[PDB]
Design an enzyme around this catalytic site. Structure first.
Site, PDB file in Angstrom:
ATOM      1  N   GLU A 106       0.826  -1.204   0.000  1.00 26.80           N
ATOM      2  CA  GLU A 106       0.000   0.000   0.000  1.00 26.80           C
ATOM      3  C   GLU A 106       0.865   1.261   0.000  1.00 26.80           C
ATOM      4  OE1 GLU A 106      -2.742  -1.243  -0.792  1.00 26.80           O
ATOM      5  OE2 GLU A 106      -3.406   0.796  -1.255  1.00 26.80           O
ATOM      6  N   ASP A 107       1.725   1.354  -1.015  1.00 25.65           N
ATOM      7  CA  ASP A 107       2.526   2.551  -1.282  1.00 25.65           C
ATOM      8  C   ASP A 107       3.507   2.862  -0.155  1.00 25.65           C
ATOM      9  OD1 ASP A 107       0.657   2.883  -3.538  1.00 25.65           O
ATOM     10  OD2 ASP A 107      -0.699   3.692  -2.014  1.00 25.65           O
ATOM     11  N   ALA A 108       3.757   1.900   0.723  1.00 25.37           N
ATOM     12  CA  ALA A 108       4.776   2.064   1.745  1.00 25.37           C
ATOM     13  C   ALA A 108       6.149   1.756   1.162  1.00 25.37           C
ATOM     14  CB  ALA A 108       4.495   1.162   2.945  1.00 25.37           C
TER      15      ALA A 108
ATOM     16  N   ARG B 176      -0.656   2.808 -11.534  1.00 23.77           N
ATOM     17  CA  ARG B 176      -0.255   4.189 -11.752  1.00 23.77           C
ATOM     18  C   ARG B 176       0.286   4.434 -13.152  1.00 23.77           C
ATOM     19  NH1 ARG B 176       0.933   3.592  -6.124  1.00 23.77           N
ATOM     20  NH2 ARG B 176      -0.861   4.527  -5.051  1.00 23.77           N
TER      21      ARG B 176
END
Ligand SMILES: [Mg+2]
Ligand SMILES: [Zn+2]
Ligand SMILES: [Zn+2]
Ligand SMILES: [Zn+2]
Lengths: 48, 65, 49, 55, 570, 72, 390, 76, 600, 48
Positions: free
Chosen positions: E197-199, E370
């Site tokens: 999660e975009d960590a 993305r």
RNA sequence: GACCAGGCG
DNA sequence: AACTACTTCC
DNA sequence: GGAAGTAGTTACGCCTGGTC
């Protein structure tokens, strides 16, 4: 006062500039009439 | 600011090599050959010398006293 | 001073103030458009003096 | 008689509040247990003195 | 119109003049006003642009300047009106006889932070917007003047680096002289679900060696204010006899003059400028300046000076060292924001068959949703630039093509796809898949978790509503808004709503006259409770309500409205 | 202790305002030069006190403890 | 096990079940008995499991259903990013869909921004496009200006000239003489001479030029055929059946024209549905329209929330909005109404009438700081005093 | 010929007798003011002989329960 | 009047919502190694915020120890309140005396410790799952920690997100939170009656890498993954294969089956079904007797047909259908048939297991993930060429008057709609070619077909043409007169001149296509804020209209004055949270479950 | 560069990228949220 | 204390 | 500004 | 029935600084 100052101030505030106000207003009316007849498109406000 | 003492990735000491690399590159030698001669084979180490900026000169002029 | 600093701003009471340009409508130019409500064609001008 | 979620929550909350003001625990509890955990243990065992009334 | 533009190109007419015509309605517009945004173009006549090779050589050798090229009529400035009449080509090989202008550089249509992004045409537009916006929040040597500058807040990355894949515009502008960020060795793999999660997963050894290290500067200000009547305040270490005196430990670092010595470690709530003001209680009051409650650091600089009116003024600058930790926000130039989800020791990080250990790991699940192919191309280019010893041109449309970069990576001795055989640090066996690894220019943003964490058990309250104050700077409380009230109601939690909205904000007790319903009065001097409206003493009982509701009753009793209260036995 | 069962809204009568008030205000001033509230002003101590060190003339409570009182 | 014993056992042990549950269980047990040999014990165990799962799924008294429905409708609206949608095909009608459509329905608009009706057809006109285009023509309201190819005015002779396209007249069924016949009686004292496909009007009572212009406006705006308020009509096929979609809205008139199936005709206008069919039909239309709008965006919301919202919206016998002039404005609590939107107006008007706030709701009890009567706030507890630890 | 009850949207309406109305009101312990109301000018009401003060039972034909009875009082 | 009305006024600003004590806020970071109902609290916040605990018979020793520790050491206390109500801050020269004088009936405001209940909230607060009660787990660093499976309810994505933490202070509030708001509950969404707390990206992708065809694991890997997942086990099952060196190997299906209930049995088709004939064969085999011979199923096993029998996974691969934000078949069945503690245990175990698989097996995305052969590139090129020629033919027909209007729209709109239809169909065909050629061994494809992250549209735009850009459903038209950019001839209606981007992201955009894509992205980013504002206002209206409606003890729904809104909630009495995807009862599921329970 | 329009209203026509912005306004650099499209930055080739 | 501006999710 | 809804003059 | 006027709203937090 509202004619000389509050209508078309860029033309002038002297009574000598009243006539040029009339010419500019006539040009604006001609443009709105041309829009009424459809001879020209709508003016875009986001156009630079 | 001033050249890092160690490579951020593998810890190899690259502090001394920067000035030699800079002068050799300004002399017109091939940067790949210079970096190979200096001993920097891993591209992590080459990144440290190739992308560093000597900013200490531009800030030494203002003193705090 | 930093020689890289480009200027273009003011110093007011010790704080650096920058004036941001405003994207206004062209003055003294009349624009025509349709109201679409009363079927009235509207032509307005922003006269500046 | 099946308790709803809200009836269970009210019963456990009232029992924990009573326990926190010196009402003796109706069972044996491990040391260090917080009063809410004591009330939950009481409810899970089934010794519930509080009774809900319905219309 | 032709005569006008020919005259302008001949030089007898100023540059600012622009003219266009419209065959549709037979109108010629001439513009000479101010505030017109324009762009330069190369004039193309009869299929041959005015600019030639000898002009370029003269410009390169310094014999010719930009204003010269504009004056000779080689390059033209057009606003939207005149551009309406134009037929612009984008590349020199696209010029035909029908073209009127040629684009000087299509890569210059971007802004400056947008030009920071390399390979911007391989990215989705939202991600380019994110990267351009996040380029303005990174940490670096913004100005060499920072040491002697007095500013409320500032940051300083200890080791800024040039982007290995960078646009030529960034060198022309001067961003290379003030870089903000560093080149990381980035591996794109999923590791223990801590980069989910975009960590972002980062290397502890890299941090301990100076990666993404920074210092935070804060400048506190204290003025010796001159009140009316000659009642001045004084810079001094206050005696404990003064009103509002803090602990004697908080003045530990102060000097007898009243100012804290430089290079002295200062923690939260320690004073820097001991100050006392003339009494105004109904002994001298204290108005000394201390650091903010959640901020620590070392006193970098103490200056003393004189104001405009003539009073003494002192600026104290405190610097706090911010080593990266969990929660600090990192971003790339391609719009991939993220916070540090884990800090992993080097012996736990995976390594490549070439001996390369990542400085940073990003989950592959953030790539396809993305659609940032530019980030992968930048990783390839960064690896190629490091291996070659020459920085890779990543300009918007004339940069090095991805095919050339892949071929060069192949010729340098690495896999053309950029995937490399990697080994798991924990277990020691090589991973089944070949891991994509490269060099990506990551920048640390100023959204540090140390500047955002806040916790308030109990503290100051507003005078009007008796509710907790607002703001991290003043021990504020978090707003439990009406949306959260509906969330609590939808759960059926009625006692929790009471506890959160009544006990913990403004619970109070009021005396209500049962006969009239107005608010009874309690005389602390006479030890009596009664209702002035009706003079009752026996039908008076307490009620429990939030102070905000009592204030509401007051504002309703103003403007002449009677909120009679009826009480019930519970 | 009681709980509010209902609230009836009405319009205050002039006699209600006169009786509920603790002071009649005449002076259009807030504080004196020394810093104390002007008697007869908007900040009269018979309407409660907010400045620390003052005392209320209607309750006798200090700032933050006196609830406040009405004037007309 | 016989097939009738299945239904007998369903009625016996499953009396405490919804009718649709009994029907589904009967059909499924029939199918599985056809496939596999189901014994009596298996059937009884299946019935017991069904009734136990039904009893376990019953809603718990004290549940705050209204706020959960409001949340479950409002939350997906944040991901209603599709909004405006365009489709490419031969015959489609423009219609507001997505978040603006939900806002329109919940706000109970007097008339939607894009009124539109779905017109079914009877067995006599539901299997041929030629037999349906005639009734579609009977529906579409068409005026002279729409049928005109061009317009022309001659003020000196008080003459109004109308050029008319033969093709759209072939596609509208009206002949030139058929166009002029009704126009003659619509406005008297006019020549109404038609020149081939270019009609010409010369009113004699138009003494002034402006009178002739007003006559021309009247003639253009007058409707020759169809139903008023209805615009473009299209024809679509589904399930071997031809249906009609119209750009206007007139429910009763469409239900009265021959050839339409009066048992399936619909309308986007909820208020008109209520005035023509009744309040229950309006509630059903609201429910199914919101369901369809949510389904078009791929968002899944339970039907029960939609039912709750529609039933609250149609509780007064009329369809009323959800905002300050609707369900909220009809709340009895003064403080609850004053908390929403207009505040000083509500308080002043409540003080005027001397309204009482019995504090029977949730909002006001939160404002004062007392338990809300929902969830754990409805639980009454009692206790026998003598407690003896074991 | 066409009655509004043959529409698929419109559920079947029916007027309850006095005994049934009393049983309904006793069942939910409610007053006629506590029921949902249907206007006396509503087409479904007019199609019946209903008059103000009367209770109408509606067979709603639910999608979740199959059938479902809903009650509305008639108001002026 | 300004004091009362307004969003900043009295009613909305200080009565409905107001600032509270004992709250904390900081950035959130992921933590897969804590349970779904737990939250990682920094030591600073735990030491700052306190829980008032009245000293009793059983917690006297612990409160004495924490009073002795004081406000400095983490397992300590800040204040001590005597029964008379007088409060004393703990400090030096007080800790020993206050610990001595603790007695019984006193109040001690102690620090947060493990097991404490708090409210966790990320506050754009749309549904009731925006606030859930979590069990405190004190952590060293200064950030909040959150399990990955609990992200979907909060809509948190660890890109700088901050969440508020509220500590309930009264025992009634603590009980209310721990009973009604805990994260074990609320796994099933009240909105659609389906699982909202489930695997998101890495859990799904790791599950697919685990259970897919031909995926085998060594003994050390199996033991390590089982220990990492927390699964209790003392003996490994018999291995499925044997390596060329004789090493035993376990199938991923066996490892996944090791953490399923021994009674569970269900079958369904997931998103990995590309050949329906194999699924139909499996269904035909199952329907004959409902208890097929396991070896017979293993003969016809397919990745697109999940078939669990007695807790053993016999066919199919783990997908978004197994557990996910919507349509998690296995998780829904486990939470509806075995309880809510079993669902939590299974969720934790499966998340940790899949995380281990994806970590130690390797999952990457590179440049090669968007590569296509020469044949696929040529096919796509011919697709765009034919589409452009068709658009040119349409334009030429419209210029000659040859085209005739479609019903319902004018000639210009007819031409526009036809052009957009042709362009969309061309994009679809190019995407179909890319889907055919890329294959299932590509990691970018793997996470898209399994629903872990990304759609087919992303892969189409990344490996093939970007397609036509549009604003408000129309082709790009805003710019100069008769054109969009001054690089095209005025009056041009062609594909490229109006926004049809013919390049992929990998192939790089031309400047014109870059500007067109910028316009599309701008329209999307503008849409987001307007949509969120309108949705917020509508949600506020709905909530203020439907706040108090509740279910009475007789089963009806009534207004505050007693008006009956519904005589039976939902017209059948079933809560949507407890319903089977909107259905009152899943009749076929119950029948199959009972028949397998008895006949099995 | 900033626009004088109110950021609360949905100025759909004013918040979108125009074809006349080419070479005058940056097509990609704009803040997220209420100010999107209403706050613009000059292109590097722009001259005022 | 309220006003403005800039950001964050 | 841009939407709605009343209100209220016509 | 107009045809204007008038009023009423337009997501939720959070952070920073600067001036009154
Ligand atoms: Mg986020
Ligand atoms: Zn190295
Ligand atoms: Zn009294
Ligand atoms: Zn007082």
């Amino acid at each position: 006062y509202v004619i000389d100052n509050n209508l078309l101030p860029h033309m002038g505030v002297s009574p000598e500039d009243r006539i040029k106000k009339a010419y500019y207003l006539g040009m604006m009316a001609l443009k709105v009439i041309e829009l009424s007849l459809g001879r020209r498109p709508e003016d875009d406000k986001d156009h630079y | 600011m001033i050249v890092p003492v160690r490579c951020f990735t593998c810890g190899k000491v690259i502090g001394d090599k920067y000035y030699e690399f800079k002068r050799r590159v300004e002399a017109g030698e091939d940067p790949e050959k210079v970096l190979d001669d200096l001993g920097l084979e891993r591209y992590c180490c080459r990144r440290m010398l190739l992308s560093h900026v000597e900013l200490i000169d531009d800030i030494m002029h203002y003193r705090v006293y | 001073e930093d020689p890289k600093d480009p200027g273009g701003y003011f110093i007011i009471n010790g704080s650096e103030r920058v004036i941001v340009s405003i994207e206004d409508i062209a003055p003294n130019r009349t624009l025509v458009e349709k109201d679409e409500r009363q079927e009235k064609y509207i032509a307005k001008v922003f006269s500046y003096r | 008689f099946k308790y709803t979620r809200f009836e269970k929550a009210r019963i456990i909350g009232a029992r924990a509040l009573q326990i926190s003001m010196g009402a003796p625990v109706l069972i044996d509890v491990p040391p260090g247990i917080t009063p809410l955990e004591a009330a939950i243990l009481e409810f899970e065992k089934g010794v519930i003195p509080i009774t809900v009334i319905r219309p | 119109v032709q005569r006008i533009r020919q005259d302008r190109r001949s030089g007898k007419i100023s540059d600012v003049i622009n003219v266009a015509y419209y065959e549709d309605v037979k109108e010629v517009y001439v513009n000479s006003d101010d505030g017109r945004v324009r762009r330069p173009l190369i004039i193309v006549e009869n299929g041959v642009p005015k600019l030639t090779k000898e002009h370029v050589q003269a410009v390169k050798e310094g014999r010719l300047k930009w204003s010269d090229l504009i004056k000779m009529g080689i390059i033209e400035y057009l606003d939207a009106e005149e551009e309406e009449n134009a037929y612009v080509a984008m590349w020199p090989w696209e010029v035909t006889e029908e073209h009127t202008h040629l684009e000087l550089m299509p890569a210059a249509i971007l802004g400056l932070p947008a030009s920071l992004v390399p390979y911007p045409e391989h990215n989705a537009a939202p991600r380019n917007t994110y990267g351009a916006g996040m380029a303005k929040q990174s940490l670096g040597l913004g100005w060499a003047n920072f040491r002697i500058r007095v500013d409320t807040r500032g940051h300083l990355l200890h080791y800024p680096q040039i982007p290995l894949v960078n646009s030529r515009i960034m060198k022309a502008v001067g961003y290379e002289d003030r870089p903000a960020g560093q080149n990381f060795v980035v591996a794109v793999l999923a590791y223990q679900g801590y980069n989910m999660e975009d960590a972002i997963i980062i290397n502890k050894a890299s941090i301990e060696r100076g990666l993404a290290r920074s210092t935070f500067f804060r400048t506190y200000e204290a003025e010796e204010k001159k009140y009316l009547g000659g009642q001045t305040d004084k810079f001094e270490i206050p005696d404990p006899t003064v009103r509002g005196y803090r602990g004697e430990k908080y003045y530990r670092n102060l000097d007898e003059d009243g100012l804290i010595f430089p290079e002295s470690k200062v923690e939260g709530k320690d004073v820097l400028v001991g100050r006392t003001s003339p009494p105004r209680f109904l002994e001298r009051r204290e108005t000394s300046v201390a650091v903010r409650p959640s901020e620590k650091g070392v006193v970098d600089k103490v200056i003393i000076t004189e104001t405009g009116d003539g009073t003494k003024l002192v600026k104290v600058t405190v610097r706090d060292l911010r080593i990266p930790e969990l929660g600090d926000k990192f971003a790339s130039r391609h719009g991939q924001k993220g916070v540090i989800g884990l800090i992993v020791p080097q012996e736990d990080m995976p390594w490549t068959e070439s001996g390369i250990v990542p400085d940073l790991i990003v989950n592959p699940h953030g790539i396809p949703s993305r659609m940032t192919v530019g980030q992968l191309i930048e990783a390839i280019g960064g690896k190629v630039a490091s291996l070659k010893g020459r920085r890779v041109d990543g300009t918007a449309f004339i940069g090095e093509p991805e095919e050339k970069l892949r071929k060069e990576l192949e010729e340098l001795g690495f896999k053309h796809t950029g995937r490399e055989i990697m080994y798991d640090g924990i277990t020691g066996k090589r991973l089944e898949a070949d891991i994509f690894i490269g060099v990506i220019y990551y920048q640390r943003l100023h959204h540090m978790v140390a500047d955002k964490i806040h916790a308030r058990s109990r503290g100051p309250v507003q005078v009007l509503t008796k509710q907790p104050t607002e703001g991290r700077a003043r021990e504020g409380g978090l707003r439990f808004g009406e949306m959260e009230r509906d969330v609590l109601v939808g759960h059926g939690a009625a006692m929790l709503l009471i506890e959160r909205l009544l006990e913990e904000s403004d619970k109070t007790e009021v005396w209500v006259c049962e006969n009239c319903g107005h608010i009874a009065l309690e005389d602390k001097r006479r030890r009596r409770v009664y209702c002035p409206v009706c003079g009752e003493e026996e039908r008076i009982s307490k009620v429990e309500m939030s102070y905000a509701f009592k204030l509401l009753l007051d504002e309703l009793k103003a403007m002449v409205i009677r909120p009679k209260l009826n009480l019930s036995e519970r | 202790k009681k709980v509010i069962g209902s609230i009836e809204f009405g319009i205050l009568s002039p006699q209600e305002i006169r009786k509920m008030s603790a002071v009649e205000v005449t002076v259009p001033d807030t504080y004196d030069d020394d810093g104390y509230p002007i008697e007869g002003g908007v900040m009269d101590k018979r309407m409660g006190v907010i400045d620390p060190g003052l005392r209320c003339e209607t309750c006798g409570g200090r700032a933050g403890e006196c609830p406040g009182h009405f004037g007309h | 096990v016989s097939l009738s014993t299945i239904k007998s056992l369903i009625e016996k042990k499953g009396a405490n079940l919804p009718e649709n549950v009994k029907s589904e269980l009967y059909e499924k047990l029939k199918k599985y008995n056809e496939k596999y040999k189901l014994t009596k014990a298996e059937i009884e165990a299946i019935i017991d499991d069904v009734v136990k799962e039904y009893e376990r799924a019953l809603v718990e008294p004290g549940e705050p259903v209204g706020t959960v429905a409001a949340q479950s409708i409002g939350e997906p609206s944040t991901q209603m990013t599709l909004n405006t949608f365009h489709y490419a095909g031969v015959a489609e009608i423009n219609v507001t869909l997505g978040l603006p459509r939900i806002i329109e329905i919940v706000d109970a608009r007097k008339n939607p921004s894009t009124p539109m009706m779905t017109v079914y057809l009877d067995e006599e006109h539901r299997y041929d496009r030629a037999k349906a285009e005639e009734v579609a023509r009977r529906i579409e309201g068409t005026t002279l200006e729409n049928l005109a190819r061009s317009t022309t005015l001659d003020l000196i002779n008080f003459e109004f000239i109308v050029e008319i396209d033969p093709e759209r007249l072939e596609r509208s069924g009206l002949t030139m003489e058929k166009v002029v016949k009704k126009l003659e009686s619509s406005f008297k004292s006019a020549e109404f001479e038609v020149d081939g496909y270019t009609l010409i009007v010369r009113p004699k009572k138009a003494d002034k030029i402006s009178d002739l212009r007003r006559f021309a406006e009247k003639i253009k705006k007058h409707r020759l055929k169809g139903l008023s308020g209805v615009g473009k009509t299209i024809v679509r096929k589904e399930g071997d059946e031809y249906v009609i979609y119209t750009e206007g809205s007139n429910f009763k008139q469409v239900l009265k024209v021959p050839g339409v199936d009066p048992t399936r005709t619909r309308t986007n206008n909820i208020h008109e549905i209520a005035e023509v069919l009744g309040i229950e039909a309006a509630r059903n239309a609201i429910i199914d329209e919101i369901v369809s709008t949510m389904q078009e965006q791929g968002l899944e919301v339970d039907i029960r929330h939609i039912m709750l919202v529609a039933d609250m919206m149609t509780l007064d016998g009329i369809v009323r909005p959800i905002g300050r002039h609707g369900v909220v404005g009809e709340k009895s609590s003064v403080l609850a109404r004053a908390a929403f939107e207009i505040t000083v107006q509500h308080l002043f008007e409540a003080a005027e009438k001397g309204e009482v706030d019995n504090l029977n709701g949730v909002i006001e009890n939160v404002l004062i700081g007392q338990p809300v009567p929902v969830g754990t706030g409805m639980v009454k507890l009692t206790m026998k005093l003598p407690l003896r630890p074991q | 010929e066409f009655s509004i009850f043959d529409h698929v949207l419109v559920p079947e309406h029916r007027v309850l007798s006095e005994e049934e109305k009393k049983a309904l009101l006793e069942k939910y312990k409610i007053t006629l003011a506590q029921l949902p109301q249907i206007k006396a000018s509503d087409p479904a009401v007019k199609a019946l002989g209903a008059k103000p003060g009367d209770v109408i039972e509606i067979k709603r034909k639910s999608p979740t329960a199959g059938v479902y009875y809903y009650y509305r009082v008639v108001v002026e | 009047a300004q004091r009362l009305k307004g969003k900043e006024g009295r009613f909305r600003g200080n009565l409905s919502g107001k600032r509270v004590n004992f709250s904390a806020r900081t950035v959130i970071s992921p933590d897969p190694m804590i349970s779904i109902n737990e939250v990682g609290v920094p030591v600073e916040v735990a030491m700052e915020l306190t829980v008032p605990e009245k000293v009793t018979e059983f917690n006297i020793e612990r409160l004495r120890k924490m009073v002795l520790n004081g406000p400095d050491k983490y397992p300590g206390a800040n204040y001590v309140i005597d029964p008379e109500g007088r409060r004393r801050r703990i400090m030096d020269s007080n800790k020993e005396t206050l610990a001595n004088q603790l007695d019984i009936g006193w109040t001690v405001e102690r620090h947060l410790m493990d097991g404490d209940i708090v409210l966790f909230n990320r506050q754009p607060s749309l549904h009731r799952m925006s606030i859930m009660a979590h069990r405190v787990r004190v952590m060293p660093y200064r950030t909040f920690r959150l399990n990955l499976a609990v992200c979907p309810p909060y809509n948190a994505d660890f890109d700088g997100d901050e969440m508020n933490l509220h500590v309930p202070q009264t025992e009634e509030a603590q009980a209310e939170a721990r009973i009604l708001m805990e994260v074990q509950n609320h796994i099933i969404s009240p909105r659609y009656g389906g699982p909202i707390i489930g695997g998101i990206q890495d859990h799904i992708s790791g599950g697919y890498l685990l259970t897919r065809e031909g995926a085998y694991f060594t003994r050390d890997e199996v033991e390590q993954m089982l220990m990492f997942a927390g699964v209790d086990i003392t003996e490994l099952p018999e291995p499925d294969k044997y390596d060329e060196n004789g090493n035993p190997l376990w199938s991923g299906k066996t490892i996944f089956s090791l953490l399923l209930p021994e009674d569970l049995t269900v079958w369904y088709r997931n998103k990995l079904c590309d050949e329906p004939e194999r699924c139909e064969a499996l269904e035909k085999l199952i329907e004959e007797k409902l208890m097929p011979d396991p070896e017979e199923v293993r003969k016809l096993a397919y990745d697109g047909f999940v078939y669990i029998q007695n807790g053993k996974l016999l066919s199919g691969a783990i997908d978004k259908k197994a557990y996910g934000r919507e349509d998690g078949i296995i998780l829904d069945l486990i939470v509806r048939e075995y309880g809510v503690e079993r669902a939590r245990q299974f969720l934790d175990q499966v998340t940790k297991l899949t995380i281990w698989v994806i970590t130690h097996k390797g999952f990457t995305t590179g440049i090669d993930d968007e590569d296509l052969p020469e044949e696929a590139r040529d096919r796509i090129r011919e697709i765009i060429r034919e589409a452009e020629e068709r658009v040119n033919k349409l334009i030429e027909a419209y210029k000659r008057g040859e085209l005739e209007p479609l019903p319902g729209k004018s000639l210009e709109d007819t031409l526009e709609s036809l052009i957009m239809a042709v362009l969309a169909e061309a994009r679809d065909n190019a995407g179909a070619v890319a889907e055919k050629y890329l294959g299932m061994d590509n990691h970018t494809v793997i996470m898209a077909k399994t629903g872990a992250r990304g759609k087919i549209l992303n892969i189409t735009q990344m490996a093939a043409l970007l397609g036509q850009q549009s604003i408000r459903g129309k082709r790009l038209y805003r710019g100069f007169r008769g054109r969009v950019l001054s690089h095209f001839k005025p009056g041009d209606l062609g594909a490229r001149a109006k926004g049809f981007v013919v390049n992929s992201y990998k192939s790089g955009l031309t400047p014109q296509e870059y500007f067109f894509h910028a316009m599309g992205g701008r329209e999307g980013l503008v849409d987001t804020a307007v949509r969120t504002a309108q949705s917020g206002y509508m949600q506020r209206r709905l909530i203020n209209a439907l706040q108090d409606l509740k279910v009475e003890y007789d089963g009806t729904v009534r207004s505050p004055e007693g008006i009956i809104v519904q005589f039976k909630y939902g017209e059948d009495g079933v809560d949507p949270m407890k319903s089977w995807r909107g259905k009152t009862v899943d009749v076929d599921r119950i029948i199959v479950r009972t028949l397998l329970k008895m006949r099995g | 560069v900033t626009s004088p329009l109110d950021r609360e209203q949905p100025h759909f026509e004013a918040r979108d990228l125009h074809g006349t912005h080419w070479g005058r306004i940056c097509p990609t650099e704009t803040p997220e949220g209420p100010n999107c499209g209403l706050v613009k930055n000059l292109a590097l080739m722009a001259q005022i």
